[PDB]
């Protein structure tokens, strides 16, 4: 017993779930970009931390 | 000797706070992810109910086991 109402409404349910997965994709895309921004910031911080050291000590830490 | 001048110290302080700003954005985004997942769970149970509801009760009961 699937009337026209139930069929239309099932169609609308699928569409609502797609809007939500589209939001999940946008969020995860942004999360990956913000992680990359953190990686880039960290590279700068790390450089600054090495820069204040005596070179033989810096050398020793780099491995 | 080491050479951490006042400039280097101040800048390192600025590096740390720039990084906290980024981790705060990461926490916000992850919060929104979990909120969006919860809305999807809520929507999925409505869809699920609709799909059971159109079946003969016996069939739905049988699938529910």
CSV table of C-alpha atoms in Angstrom, one decimal:
chain,number,residue,atom,x,y,z
A,1,UNK,CA,0.0,0.0,0.0
A,2,UNK,CA,2.2,2.8,-1.3
A,3,UNK,CA,-0.1,5.7,-2.3
A,4,UNK,CA,0.9,8.7,-4.4
A,5,UNK,CA,1.4,10.7,-1.2
A,6,UNK,CA,3.9,8.1,0.2
A,7,UNK,CA,5.8,8.0,-3.1
A,8,UNK,CA,6.1,11.8,-3.4
A,9,UNK,CA,7.1,12.0,0.3
A,10,UNK,CA,9.7,9.3,-0.2
A,11,UNK,CA,11.2,11.4,-3.0
A,12,UNK,CA,11.3,14.4,-0.7
A,13,UNK,CA,13.0,12.4,2.1
A,14,UNK,CA,15.8,11.4,-0.3
A,15,UNK,CA,16.2,15.1,-1.3
A,16,UNK,CA,16.4,16.2,2.3
A,17,UNK,CA,19.1,13.6,3.0
A,18,UNK,CA,21.0,14.8,0.0
A,19,UNK,CA,20.9,18.4,1.2
A,20,UNK,CA,22.5,17.1,4.5
A,21,UNK,CA,25.2,15.2,2.8
A,22,UNK,CA,26.0,18.2,0.7
A,23,UNK,CA,26.5,20.2,3.9
A,24,UNK,CA,28.8,17.4,5.3
A,25,UNK,CA,30.9,17.6,2.1
A,26,UNK,CA,31.2,21.4,2.4
A,27,UNK,CA,32.2,21.1,6.1
A,28,UNK,CA,34.8,18.4,5.4
A,29,UNK,CA,36.3,20.3,2.5
A,30,UNK,CA,36.7,23.3,4.8
A,31,UNK,CA,38.1,21.1,7.5
A,32,UNK,CA,40.8,19.9,5.1
A,33,UNK,CA,41.6,23.4,4.1
A,34,UNK,CA,41.9,24.6,7.7
A,35,UNK,CA,44.2,21.7,8.5
A,36,UNK,CA,46.4,22.7,5.5
A,37,UNK,CA,46.4,26.3,6.9
A,38,UNK,CA,47.5,24.9,10.3
A,39,UNK,CA,50.3,22.9,8.6
A,40,UNK,CA,51.5,26.1,6.9
A,41,UNK,CA,51.4,28.0,10.1
A,42,UNK,CA,53.3,25.2,11.9
A,43,UNK,CA,56.1,25.3,9.3
A,44,UNK,CA,56.7,29.0,10.1
A,45,UNK,CA,56.6,28.3,13.9
A,46,UNK,CA,59.1,25.4,13.5
A,47,UNK,CA,61.4,27.6,11.4
A,48,UNK,CA,61.3,30.2,14.2
A,49,UNK,CA,62.0,27.6,16.9
A,50,UNK,CA,65.1,26.3,15.0
A,51,UNK,CA,66.3,29.8,14.2
A,52,UNK,CA,67.1,30.8,17.8
A,53,UNK,CA,69.3,27.7,18.4
A,54,UNK,CA,73.1,27.4,18.0
A,55,UNK,CA,73.6,25.7,14.6
A,56,UNK,CA,75.3,22.5,15.9
A,57,UNK,CA,72.3,22.0,18.2
A,58,UNK,CA,69.8,22.7,15.4
A,59,UNK,CA,71.7,20.2,13.3
A,60,UNK,CA,71.6,17.6,16.0
A,61,UNK,CA,67.8,17.9,16.3
A,62,UNK,CA,67.1,17.6,12.6
A,63,UNK,CA,68.7,14.1,12.7
B,1,UNK,CA,74.9,30.5,23.1
B,2,UNK,CA,71.3,30.7,21.9
B,3,UNK,CA,69.9,33.8,20.3
B,4,UNK,CA,66.3,34.3,21.3
B,5,UNK,CA,65.9,38.1,21.2
B,6,UNK,CA,62.8,40.0,22.3
B,7,UNK,CA,61.7,40.0,18.6
B,8,UNK,CA,61.8,36.2,18.4
B,9,UNK,CA,60.0,35.7,21.7
B,10,UNK,CA,57.2,38.1,20.7
B,11,UNK,CA,56.8,36.5,17.3
B,12,UNK,CA,56.7,33.0,18.8
B,13,UNK,CA,53.9,34.2,21.0
B,14,UNK,CA,52.1,35.4,17.8
B,15,UNK,CA,52.7,32.0,16.1
B,16,UNK,CA,51.1,30.2,19.1
B,17,UNK,CA,48.0,32.4,19.0
B,18,UNK,CA,47.6,32.1,15.2
B,19,UNK,CA,47.7,28.3,15.7
B,20,UNK,CA,45.1,28.4,18.5
B,21,UNK,CA,42.8,30.5,16.1
B,22,UNK,CA,43.1,27.7,13.6
B,23,UNK,CA,42.4,24.9,16.1
B,24,UNK,CA,39.4,26.9,17.3
B,25,UNK,CA,38.1,26.9,13.7
B,26,UNK,CA,38.7,23.1,13.5
B,27,UNK,CA,36.7,22.6,16.7
B,28,UNK,CA,33.8,24.7,15.3
B,29,UNK,CA,33.8,22.8,12.0
B,30,UNK,CA,33.8,19.4,13.9
B,31,UNK,CA,31.0,20.6,16.1
B,32,UNK,CA,29.0,21.4,12.9
B,33,UNK,CA,29.8,18.0,11.5
B,34,UNK,CA,28.4,16.3,14.5
B,35,UNK,CA,25.3,18.5,14.5
B,36,UNK,CA,24.8,17.8,10.7
B,37,UNK,CA,25.3,14.0,11.3
B,38,UNK,CA,22.6,14.1,14.1
B,39,UNK,CA,20.2,15.9,11.7
B,40,UNK,CA,20.8,13.2,9.1
B,41,UNK,CA,20.1,10.5,11.7
B,42,UNK,CA,16.9,12.3,12.5
B,43,UNK,CA,15.9,12.5,8.8
B,44,UNK,CA,16.9,8.8,8.2
B,45,UNK,CA,14.5,7.6,10.8
B,46,UNK,CA,11.6,9.4,9.2
B,47,UNK,CA,12.5,7.9,5.8
B,48,UNK,CA,12.9,4.5,7.4
B,49,UNK,CA,9.4,4.8,9.1
B,50,UNK,CA,7.9,5.7,5.7
B,51,UNK,CA,9.5,2.7,4.1
B,52,UNK,CA,8.2,0.2,6.7
B,53,UNK,CA,4.8,1.9,6.7
B,54,UNK,CA,4.0,1.1,3.1
B,55,UNK,CA,4.5,-2.7,3.6
B,56,UNK,CA,1.9,-5.2,4.7
B,57,UNK,CA,2.3,-5.2,8.5
B,58,UNK,CA,3.4,-8.9,8.6
B,59,UNK,CA,6.3,-8.3,6.1
B,60,UNK,CA,7.5,-5.2,8.0
B,61,UNK,CA,7.3,-7.2,11.3
B,62,UNK,CA,9.4,-10.0,9.6
B,63,UNK,CA,12.1,-7.5,8.4
B,64,UNK,CA,12.2,-5.9,11.9
B,65,UNK,CA,13.6,-9.2,13.3
